[PDB]
Design a protein around this ligand. Structure first.
Ligand SMILES: CCCCCCCC/C=C\CCCCCCCC(=O)OC[C@H](COP(=O)(O)OCC[N+](C)(C)C)OC(=O)CCCCCCC/C=C\CCCCCCCC
Ligand SMILES: CCCCCCCC/C=C\CCCCCCCC(=O)OC[C@H](COP(=O)(O)OCC[N+](C)(C)C)OC(=O)CCCCCCC/C=C\CCCCCCCC
Ligand SMILES: CCCCCCCC/C=C\CCCCCCCC(=O)OC[C@H](COP(=O)(O)OCC[N+](C)(C)C)OC(=O)CCCCCCC/C=C\CCCCCCCC
Ligand SMILES: CCCCCCCC/C=C\CCCCCCCC(=O)OC[C@H](COP(=O)(O)OCC[N+](C)(C)C)OC(=O)CCCCCCC/C=C\CCCCCCCC
Ligand SMILES: CCCCCCCCCCCCCCCCCC(=O)OC[C@H](COP(=O)(O)OC[C@H](N)C(=O)O)OC(=O)CCCCCCCCCCCCCCCCC
Ligand SMILES: CC(C)CCC[C@@H](C)[C@H]1CC[C@H]2[C@@H]3CC=C4C[C@@H](O)CC[C@]4(C)[C@H]3CC[C@]12C
Ligand code: ALF
Ligand SMILES: [Mg+2]
Length: 997
């Protein structure tokens, strides 16, 4: 609402404030109570198709421009308006209802009298909120206090930025050292924070405690923050709220909900202007026939009003009820269960998607990593050979009290169990205490915690193999053997993992034998020169990486009691330096990283969701280009692309390097252009430079690519890529995601599909369609999307044909019969009333199918036909227009020739010959017959014969029931329908359709 300013937030006291802060509520609604009606009415009557019916009714207030009754212009308009309002109201109420699950979650609040329970929507700035383990963070907070004695916590942020790594956060130093949690309320402290912005990974703030005799000021960064939408992984934490509601970092990265219109609806709207333009041209030309005769304008509007049914109100009604049937079918399909249709007015856009932009974390992957392959050079182990590694480990320790391949397996497993940064955590199961399970090393209470999920998966595998990690401190590790002996190790030097070095190291001392070993693990690129000569490391790493695995190289070096002293006494010297510490310390570490004994290669896989590989292949065979836009790091994203077969096994990958300016971006864009059939991997930082200077050049090069992978993408960058694809290509795009960082790109895309996340529902709540699994996307496109697009095209073009045949008939009647009369207008409406006996059979076109659901799934090439716009184009429209003119002329001119006796005897043959003609045309169009199509065509015949019997006795119209009436009606129908009943038969022979084979 206003320019954001910095705020001073006092601990407790949600009343010492300057401005007023927004409610901590999440809203996905388009309108509130006040803006509902103006918004719904304006979004409807701003299109020529809907505004046309409103101007017709308003013209009737003028007495000189009045024609017909007044309830024939407003009752159809009122019924149409009464469906848009009810349909829009139902959508808003359920959006409100589905927003109540997140907004009504119960948390705890520290008050002066004790902890009380608060709802998420009632949380205020300055409140002290308690968030427990595995719970969502309700608002943006500053980490104040934790219940653990390690003084930190881990955060899962996959629903905020799409990163698989856990984030370590630390509390404010003063608040963590207080004896009691309630002590935070008896101190005079405030937090000075920057104005709300969009940056998720940056924060500037200050913590000040006035009470202490020496005032204390701490600088705060992202390490002290707990943003909303994250999940606490360990223990209960206490924080103070800074931002609520629309000022949340997640919400500030989200756009406002909008009302979407489909491309199909934009094309029917264009056809109505052509139909209206043709009618006006006739009116303007017809008044030139008289060379103008005074008050010429009174005749044009009268002519326009009389032939106003060239655009029928049944086009709006039939399309509205058709879309109701499509959403009913999608909500009830048992082969894609759990699908919710939120935007029920665009089901036909699912059948013309050209670009599919998808998230990686949580959409394609299960967010679960597992150890898969161990390679010792001379032998490899997989999930089916892990029962032999357990025997090698058991053999050594069963023979401890009682080289070979058993001693080569043991050396590799012991290295994986020591070279990491994983700390075991014990928690009270309810009978056993945290202080008792720690002593006895119970397995059911143990949890492994680390920043890297890969390290946790490695440690979880050694436990299942025989070597368990039961304890860890800052200077000690404890391992349990198959014979339940505890091995104690002393951590002497640890070198943590950095994304620049891409490797990790540790030095340990065995307290049983006294030996000192140096362990190092890292990527194959950096560890190739560190290890001794071999002939299998580079070969097998490429084979491992080509399977979508994450490969680490493990090495060893035994140090004596003299080389460590030459290192320890030299490593400390570099630390106590004040000039260039980074390069001084580094040169001492790389002096130890030479001639290391290679041990093994480990492969870790991030598990895909069910049927991800077949689904991606099906979409690619349908002509849909798939891009992966993820907020995760480059290395993890490339592994998932190869694992999911987004990039083919033989495909070549070009990795875009870090460009920082206009000059560097031009060089790298020319380098990529010189490649052929290459997949593009580019980071968000390099993408910002490329889109700034070479937006056209970059976009054209990426659209010829087989696949494009964008990593470390901000939520605004994902929506920017979607917008440029729409502008530069003019084709529909689809966006699939599961987290809160994909809401921006789902709202921007033409068709937004949200996958229901495991720890969040924000993307599912903001999408047009919500699915529970990624594999449900294939059937939602090739079956439901294709049928909706094909049924709408056939149904809309038949209503237009029916209204154009009537207009042609009532133009021959108005000239070739009388050229002027008052009784004509009575027959003018009788002909137009013939659409009552075709009301049901034409609507039964929503039941039609060309192929079966098991055939559209097996042959994705049927989908590329819809991408060309074949169902509705200018060719199909023109053919339908020519048939309408031919059929209307044949019925009317055949009525005035076969029996030109009287007016009553002429509206009896033409009205009959038109119902039969339209009933026969529906039977011609239907490809697959349903049993409801049969009763619809046979009930309409019955109520027409019945209506020709009741009026037969009352009105003296015995002319109907004879033999003379029979042959003239039969002849006219045969001349009308049969020529179009033979061309279709010839079409099958000469030009068969692909779905027929
Ligand atoms: C027309 C607007 O077009 P534009 O060219 O400005 O494009 C708008 C272009 N944009 C979207 C790009 C900015 O749309 C409009 O006028 C705005 C919408 C007007 C809606 C008026 C609704 C009145 C209907 C009343 C029926 C209710 C029952 C009445 C019963 C009466 C019985 C006698
Ligand atoms: C043979 C084929 C080739 C043609 C040859 C030449 C023929 C020339 C004759 C007609 C052609 C020009 C008129 C075409 C129809 C209007 C087209 C138009 O440019 O539309 C302007 C907009 C509709 O834009 P949109 O929906 O495409 O934009 C969608 C995008 N968005 C909404 C975000 C902006 O606004 C509107 O609909 C207002 C449009 C004008 C008002 C409606 C006209 C019909 C209604 C009543 C007629 C008179 C009845 C009596 C009225 C008495 C009142 C007292
Ligand atoms: C005449 C007045 C028609 C009013 C239509 C608006 C309500 C449609 C409806 O009835 O709301 C959608 C239901 C809900 O379905 P559910 O929540 O029971 O499914 C688990 O879907 C269905 O029944 C099928 C109807 C889906 C059409 C939604 C509106 C499309 C325009
Ligand atoms: C009777 C006299 C004349 C009628 C003759 C028939 C005319 C055409 C009726 C079409 C119809 O009746 O379509 C019923 C629809 C869909 O039924 P389906 O047979 O296509 O089954 C779908 C399952 N599949 C696809 C596997 C077969 O059901 C729906 O739309 C239910 C929509 C409910 C909306 C209630 C109001 C909401 C506000
Ligand atoms: C003020 C608020 C009012 C709220 C509603 C109140 C309702 C009150 C009812 C009062 C009695 C009924 C009055 C009906 C008025 C319309 C009569 C009618 O049928 O028109 C037929 C119309 C053409 O009409 P016209 O007279 O030639 O011209 C009108 C005017 N002179 C004009 O040109 O301007 O030709 C058409 O255009 C057809 C129009 C209907 C279209 C229906 C299409 C089919 C829909 C789908 C049917 C199948 C559905 C199946 C569902 C599932 C079933 C199992
Ligand atoms: C002129 C209109 C009113 C009626 C048209 C004929 C009527 C009786 C309808 C009712 C049942 C319909 C049939 C239902 C089933 C099939 C099987 C299908 O594989 C070919 C079409 C065919 C054979 C349909 C032809 C048209 C049909 C025979
Ligand atoms: F799950 Al993502 F970017 F891969 F939000
Ligand atoms: Mg995600």
């Amino acid at each position: 609402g206003g320019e954001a300013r910095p705020r001073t937030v006092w601990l407790g006291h949600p009343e010492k404030r300057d401005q007023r802060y927004p409610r901590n509520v999440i809203n996905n609604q388009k309108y509130n109570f006040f803006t509902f009606l103006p918004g719904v009415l304006f979004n409807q009557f701003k299109y020529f198709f809907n505004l046309y019916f409103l101007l017709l009714a308003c013209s009737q207030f003028v007495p000189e421009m009045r024609l017909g009754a007044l309830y024939t212009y407003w009752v159809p308009l009122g019924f149409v308006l009464a469906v848009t309002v009810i349909r829009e109201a139902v959508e808003e109420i359920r959006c409100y209802v589905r927003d109540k699950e997140v907004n009504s979650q119960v948390y705890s609040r520290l008050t002066a009298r004790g902890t009380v329970k608060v709802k998420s929507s009632n949380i205020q700035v300055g409140d002290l909120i308690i968030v427990e383990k595995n719970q969502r963070v309700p608002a943006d907070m500053i980490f104040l206090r934790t219940s653990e004695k390690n003084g930190s916590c881990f955060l899962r942020t996959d629903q905020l930025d799409g990163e698989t790594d856990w984030k370590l956060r630390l509390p404010v130093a003063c608040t963590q050292r207080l004896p009691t949690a309630a002590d935070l309320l008896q101190i005079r402290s405030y937090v000075y924070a920057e104005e709300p912005n969009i940056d998720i990974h940056n924060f500037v703030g200050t913590f000040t405690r006035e009470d202490s005799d020496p005032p204390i000021s701490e600088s705060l960064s992202i390490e002290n923050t707990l943003w909303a939408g994250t999940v606490v992984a360990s223990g209960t934490v206490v924080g103070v709220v800074l931002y609520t509601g629309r000022e949340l970092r997640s919400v500030m990265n989200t756009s406002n909900p909008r009302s979407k219109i489909g491309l199909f609806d934009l094309e029917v709207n264009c056809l109505t202007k052509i139909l209206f333009g043709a009618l006006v041209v006739v009116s303007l030309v017809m008044v030139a026939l008289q060379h103008f005769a005074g008050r010429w304008y009174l005749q044009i509007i009268r002519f326009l009003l009389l032939f106003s049914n060239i655009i029928p109100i049944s086009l709006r009604v039939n399309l509205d009820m058709g879309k109701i049937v499509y959403s009913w079918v999608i909500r009830r399909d048992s082969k894609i269960p759990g699908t919710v249709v939120r935007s029920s007015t665009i089901p036909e856009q699912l059948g013309r998607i050209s670009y599919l932009l998808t998230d990686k974390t949580g959409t394609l992957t299960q967010n679960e990593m597992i150890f898969k392959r161990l390679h010792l050079g001379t032998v490899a182990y997989g999930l089916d050979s892990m029962d032999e590694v357990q025997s090698h480990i058991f053999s050594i320790y069963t023979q401890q009290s009682q080289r070979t391949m058993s001693s080569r397996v043991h050396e590799a497993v012991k290295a994986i169990a020591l070279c990491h940064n994983v700390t075991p955590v014990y928690e009270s199961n309810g009978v056993t205490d945290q202080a008792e399970a720690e002593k006895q090393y119970e397995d059911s209470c143990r949890v492994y915690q680390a920043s890297s999920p890969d390290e946790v998966a490695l440690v979880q595998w050694t436990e299942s193999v025989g070597l368990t990690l039961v304890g860890r401190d800052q200077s000690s590790m404890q391992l349990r053997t198959p014979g339940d002996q505890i091995l104690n190790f002393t951590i002497l030097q640890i070198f943590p993992f950095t994304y620049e070095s891409k490797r990790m190291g540790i030095i340990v001392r065995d307290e049983s034998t006294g030996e000192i070993t140096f362990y190092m693990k890292g990527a194959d690129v950096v560890m190739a020169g560190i290890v001794q000569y071999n002939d299998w490391l580079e070969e097998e790493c490429g084979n491992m990486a080509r399977e979508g695995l994450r490969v680490l190289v493990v090495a060893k070096k035994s140090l004596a009691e003299e080389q460590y002293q030459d290192f320890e006494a030299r490593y400390v010297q570099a630390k106590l330096s004040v000039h260039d510490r980074s390069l001084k310390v580094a040169t001492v570490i790389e002096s130890l990283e030479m001639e290391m004994e290679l041990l093994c290669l480990t492969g870790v896989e991030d598990q895909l969701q069910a049927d991800v590989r077949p689904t991606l292949e099906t979409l690619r065979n349908a002509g849909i280009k798939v891009w992966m836009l993820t907020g995760d790091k480059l290395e993890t994203a490339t592994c998932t692309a190869k694992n999911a077969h987004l990039v083919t096994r033989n495909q070549d990958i070009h990795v875009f390097r870090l460009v920082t300016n206009r000059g560097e971006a031009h060089l790298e864009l020319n380098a990529f252009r010189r490649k052929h059939d290459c997949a593009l991997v580019i980071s968000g930082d390099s993408l910002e430079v490329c889109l700034k200077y070479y937006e056209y050049e970059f976009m054209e090069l990426a659209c010829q690519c087989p696949a494009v992978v964008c990593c470390r993408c901000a939520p605004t960058q994902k929506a920017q890529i979607v917008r440029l694809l729409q502008e530069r290509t003019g084709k529909l795009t689809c966006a699939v995601g599961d987290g809160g960082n994909d809401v921006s790109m789902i709202q921007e895309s033409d068709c937004g599909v949200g996958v229901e996340g495991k720890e969040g529902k924000q993307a599912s709540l903001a999408a047009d369609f919500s699915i529970t699994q990624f594999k449900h996307l294939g059937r939602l496109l090739m079956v439901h999307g294709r049928n909706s697009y094909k049924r709408s095209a056939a149904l809309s073009q038949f209503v237009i044909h029916r209204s154009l045949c009537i207009s042609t008939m009532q133009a021959v009647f108005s000239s070739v019969f009388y050229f002027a009369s008052v009784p004509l207008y009575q027959g003018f409406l009788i002909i137009g009333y013939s659409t009552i006996y075709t009301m049901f059979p034409v609507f039964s076109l929503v039941l039609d199918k060309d192929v079966k659901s098991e055939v559209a799934m097996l042959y994705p090439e049927l989908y590329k036909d819809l991408l060309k716009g074949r169902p509705l184009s200018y060719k199909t429209f023109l053919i339908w227009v020519l048939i309408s003119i031919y059929q209307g002329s044949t019925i009317m001119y055949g009525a005035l020739l076969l029996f030109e006796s009287e007016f009553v005897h002429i509206v009896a043959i033409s009205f009959t010959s038109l119902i039969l003609t339209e009933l026969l045309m529906v039977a011609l169009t239907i490809q697959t017959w349903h049993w409801l199509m049969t009763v619809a065509e046979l009930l309409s015949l019955a109520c027409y014969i019945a209506s020709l019997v009741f009026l037969h006795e009352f009105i003296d119209v015995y002319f109907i029931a004879t033999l003379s009436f029979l042959w003239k009606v039969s002849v006219i129908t045969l001349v009308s329908c049969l020529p179009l009943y033979v061309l279709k038969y010839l079409r099958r022979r000469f030009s068969p359709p692909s779905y027929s084979k």
